[PDB]
Amino acid sequence: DPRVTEILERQIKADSYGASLVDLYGMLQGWEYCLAVAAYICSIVAGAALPLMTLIFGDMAQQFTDYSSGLHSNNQFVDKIDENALYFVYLGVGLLVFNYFATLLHIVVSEIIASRVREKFIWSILHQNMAYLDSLGSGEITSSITSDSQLIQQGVSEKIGLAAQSIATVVSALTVAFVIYWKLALVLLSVMVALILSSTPTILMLMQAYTDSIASYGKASSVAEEAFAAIKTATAFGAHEFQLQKYDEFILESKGYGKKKAISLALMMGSIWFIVFATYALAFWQGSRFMVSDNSGIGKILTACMAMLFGSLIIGNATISLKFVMVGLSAASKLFAMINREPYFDSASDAGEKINEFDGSISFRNVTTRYPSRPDITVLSDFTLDIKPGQTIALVGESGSGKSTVIALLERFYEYLDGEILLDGVDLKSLNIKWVRQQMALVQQEPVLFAASIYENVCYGLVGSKYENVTEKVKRELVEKACKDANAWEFISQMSNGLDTEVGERGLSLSGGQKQRIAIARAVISEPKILLLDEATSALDTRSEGIVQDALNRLSETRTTIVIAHRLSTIQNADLIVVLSKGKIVETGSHKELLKKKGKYHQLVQIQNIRTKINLFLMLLQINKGDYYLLIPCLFLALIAGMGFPSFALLAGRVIEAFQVTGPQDFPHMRSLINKYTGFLFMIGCVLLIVYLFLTSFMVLSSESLVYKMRYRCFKQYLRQDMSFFDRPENKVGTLVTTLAKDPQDIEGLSGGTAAQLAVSVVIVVAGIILAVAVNWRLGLVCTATVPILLGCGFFSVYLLMVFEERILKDYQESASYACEQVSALKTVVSLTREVGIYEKYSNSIKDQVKRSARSVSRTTLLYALIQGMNPWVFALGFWYGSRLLLEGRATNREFFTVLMAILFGCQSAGEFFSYAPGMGKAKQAAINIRQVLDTRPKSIDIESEDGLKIDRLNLKGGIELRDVTFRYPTRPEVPVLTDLNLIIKPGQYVGLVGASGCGKSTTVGLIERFYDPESGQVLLDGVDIRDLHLRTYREVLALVQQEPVLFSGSIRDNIMVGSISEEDMIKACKDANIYDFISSLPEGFDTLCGNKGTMLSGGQKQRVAIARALIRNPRVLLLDEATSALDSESEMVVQDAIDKASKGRTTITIAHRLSTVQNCDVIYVFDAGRIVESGKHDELLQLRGKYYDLVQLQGLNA
Ligand SMILES: COCC(CCO[C@H]1CC[C@@]2(C)C(=CC[C@H]3[C@@H]4C[C@@H]5O[C@]6(CC[C@@H](C)CO6)[C@@H](C)[C@@H]5[C@@]4(C)CC[C@@H]32)C1)COC
């Protein structure tokens, strides 16, 4: 027990890992480290040189004020201005150079790190033991290959460079502000820190609201998942409003939390602007108060104020960039957990022995095995067997005996706890695993061919052979010979290219017969010593089976072979047959020997013989008409913003002019002016605050509303679709749930909030331009011509960042798809030992991709650096022109700084709208997908349409008639299920539809319920076609009891009343279902929760609840689609008691696999390939000695 349990956990134990940036940045080797260092240095420099613009602005402001006061001569003013303009030019050039190098080197280093991570991941995944790989959920490895490596690459991409730039900018801004003027900087820092620690409550509230909304939509998404999975039951019982009301109850909680989200976002975005203008006014006021003692001047006050705000504003950029770093580290924590895990079997190394002159003899001695997933069941117990060279052995038995467990033990996929497996007397645990797998050839039931030429697919089996590295002509001859010996040359010659044709997604797609023969050729070409045939003809068509079986027999006449045959006629001439029952060998010997013993083999042969004998924005705005009451004020607060920012610029210009003091004699007057305007700069600062407290709020509210509708309607548009919509491969339950999660959420980027923000930004930009032109037309015209440049730069910074974000995902697609292809077929890869070749191909692909990607990036990084450096040049031109204007008297210091602050506000307000650009990158896509979903309408089976003859209960006879019905499943229209089916149920008949499996007897339920319409033919209820009846009332007449009982999450009373068409009909139905006793025995009454929690119920009680649900509506036609073909024998009797009572008094159509139930049917119909072969009662069918007789004999033997 201790050793066994330790082995079973160690085979599957996935140890966790906590990754950091040390692990990610240690992927560099040697001279690559310098690149990383260089990148960071550049980033830091590109962040430290940015707040020097505040220094140069302060110096130019001081020069302008001094010249206006009359302190210095024209020549001095011109020379100083020109020197400051040169300083802007130098700063712009430096910003360009360092931004280029920082971005390029960060991207290159991220490419290198992620490529190393990808290589290590694929190498590690390929060489894990199969037990761990099976444990990994479906699609986990492919998601780690495709969508977890991009996150790692982003975490160390230019995003971390921008985070470092933001931190450096904050540090440098604080340093500049404290070095130039420390007293005012200290006062401003104290006030800002106080106002931030005072806004910590609002941030906490916003994060809480986000978390609560996420949880509420998680509950809503669980309701959506259960409805889609149980869409048949909901369609049959008309539970399309019940599911929608359970969904709407949870997407109305998300709206309630979105109202807190809106309030918190409005408060936070108002606090951020309160800090801005409060600091501005306080800086100017306290600087004037300190000037009466320091003579600091306007320059130092402006430098300190600008540096403080600059530093604070960039804190937001650091947080957004650091989000990517945190997400990347979490993805690394995942990928490094798997990369570091050591496999249970050391197949990567070359440790082990290699048998020379391998004969091909195998020996199992008391082999015992328990799978790691289920450590309590012994799948294989005391397995003993000896296979001499040349002996073809056959493993037979019922499903779950453990036949494929022997092959899994041989191939080292799983570990055997006790016993001993010997290859020519050498223990299997002391042999090289890759060599062991090379000495065998595994031919599975489902053949896997990879996306390559048939020549390459066949050569995939030459790994580790003596012919692995030979001249290509010898390889071509070998492939030709192997394809001839596999009966594959015949159809290969027919194809145009021949051996070079590409079998895979791209190129021709072959039938199982061709794919299986190519797999046989790939197996034979290696000349194996042991052949493992695991049902190589199980899924094959009967006609194809002949050619392939011939190939398999010719292959296996001369090698040690272990045949697991689905058809026992193929293994009659096997040298030895072993019968397995629950992992134990019951008998072994020749065909004639076992038959004379009349044991399990005799029964299996008899059953086989019997079976053989029987056989865009305006659209969403129009949808959300409610936003019309959130767009009447938003065009009035915008007007207020358009009259508040120009006023703010005017006041700022007046305050700067007030500082034109020649000496200490002007300090009193200045102070008075400073005071007065600083009052207005507050009174107009608060008004705008109020606007933000409303405006942002409305934005978020609007968005929330839209999302809610885009959820509700979308769900209401999925429940409307007919079953053919849900049969399509794309419309999986998980896919539809993910679409409901994503698209309604993502369409929030083109809501009324975006329109309001765009309108506000446009109004502010236009108001700034108008104010600048009115104040001084000579200056406003240049401001009008610099604003297009200053806005394009701000937009294209975001656009190029988006391009950098998209490149990572769009570039590693030709290579991630290859890895997902070779990993989705991982047992085939492992058994061929194609692990090294796949590693070499994938590594070469991504190594080429790195070199391509660096040169791809450099071109865009050039433009990004140019845009980043553009701003100081614009400021230099503006200041030079302004100084030339003050020279000629055509402008005033007040007018110049009013224009400057106006264009500053315009560019800061238009940069709020550009941050919406990434969102509209996805929202647009979402919008078009949602429009298709809303427009999707079922062809004929529509529940919402009120067109059709309604049914009258008084005249409702309840008879059914399928007249000349033929039907094909739309997914596979080639294969017919029903052909020319003529069938009649008279009213009140208890009819049973028995038949061989695959006869399409269960499709009659779908046709009567009108899940589908017949391709050609008619279905009539009481002489009236069902296509002319109202679907809702028709389905209310019917009732359905499915094979596996479905109970939607909720109380027992709710599930039982789903089929209600008074609290006493429900009791009566529960009594008729023999379930009321169990209900009264529950801790509570009918309020007990069943779905997904509460008192769990057995299959019998679930089926009885389903029967009561069907019974409440008092149906005239009860459709029992194998209501007991899921129950154990003991439970089946009470469920059958419930079923028999329901049949009395109404038309009942029972499809049953256990023909004991249908023994009391008035008329029994037997199906065969979709047509009614035999009809009549039980005794007459028995006397007929036909297909029903064979079925009852088969059921008697099968047990
Ligand atoms: C699951 O959660 C998902 C998440 C939900 C929202 O999370 C919030 C977390 C806090 C965070 C990052 C958010 C918005 C504004 C951010 C603030 C701006 C302020 O600016 C400063 C500096 C400048 C000052 C003037 C004002 O204060 C900072 C101290 C303040 C700040 C950086 C503190 C952190 C805030 C988003 C994202 O969803 C898209």
Ligand SMILES: COc1ccc(CCN(C)CCC[C@](C#N)(c2ccc(OC)c(OC)c2)C(C)C)cc1OC
């Ligand atoms: C022109 O291109 C851009 C220009 C500026 C920006 C920066 C965006 N700003 C940080 C938005 C500031 C928002 C904010 C408000 N309200 C604000 C701050 C300062 C402002 O003037 C100094 C301001 O004027 C409206 C607004 C604060 C809440 C932060 C980005 C740009 O591209 C994304």
Ligand SMILES: Nc1ncnc2c1ncn2[C@@H]1O[C@H](COP(=O)(O)OP(=O)(O)NP(=O)(O)O)[C@@H](O)[C@H]1O
């Ligand atoms: N990876 C696994 N983890 C746990 N149990 C497993 C695993 N694989 C198979 N089993 C169970 O082990 C038993 C034997 O499985 P298996 O060896 O596949 O039998 P089989 O006779 O080859 N099946 P079949 O090919 O359908 O006739 C059954 O109970 C299986 O459900």
Ligand SMILES: [Mg+2]
């Ligand atoms: Mg099997």
